């Protein structure tokens, strides 16, 4: 029982981090002269939970 639950929670963590990796590689990918660039509303906002290192 213990092993099955541990494996599933690790699975969740893994999918989360790989999604993050997708987002960040896109962030590096884009640049200027790009159809998606514009002014967005007050993005200087700090997040609510704001996990630390």
């Amino acid at each position: 029982c213990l092993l099955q639950e541990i494996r599933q929670q690790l699975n969740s963590d893994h999918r989360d981090k790989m999604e993050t990796l997708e987002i960040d590689r896109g962030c590096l990918s884009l640049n200027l002269t790009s159809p998606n660039i514009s002014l967005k509303v007050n993005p200087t906002r700090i997040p609510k939970d704001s996990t630390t290192l």
């Binding site: 987002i23 962030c27 200027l32």
Partner: protein, 54 residues
């Protein structure tokens, strides 16, 4: 005699003024395109910093 001297001096003045005017006009035009590029780059960086919230 003194009149004609004055006349020559004035023409010298006007010619130099003309050339300075042309050079300044060119410089100003350059400055406007500097403005435009500044705003473009700000747009890009704004988007970048926004996107991480996902």
């Amino acid at each position: 005699r003194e009149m004609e001297s004055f006349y020559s001096e004035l023409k010298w003045q006007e010619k130099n003024t003309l050339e300075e005017i042309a050079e300044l006009q060119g410089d100003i035009r350059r400055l406007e395109e500097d403005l435009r590029r500044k705003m473009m780059n700000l747009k890009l960086a704004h988007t970048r910093l926004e996107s991480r919230t996902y």
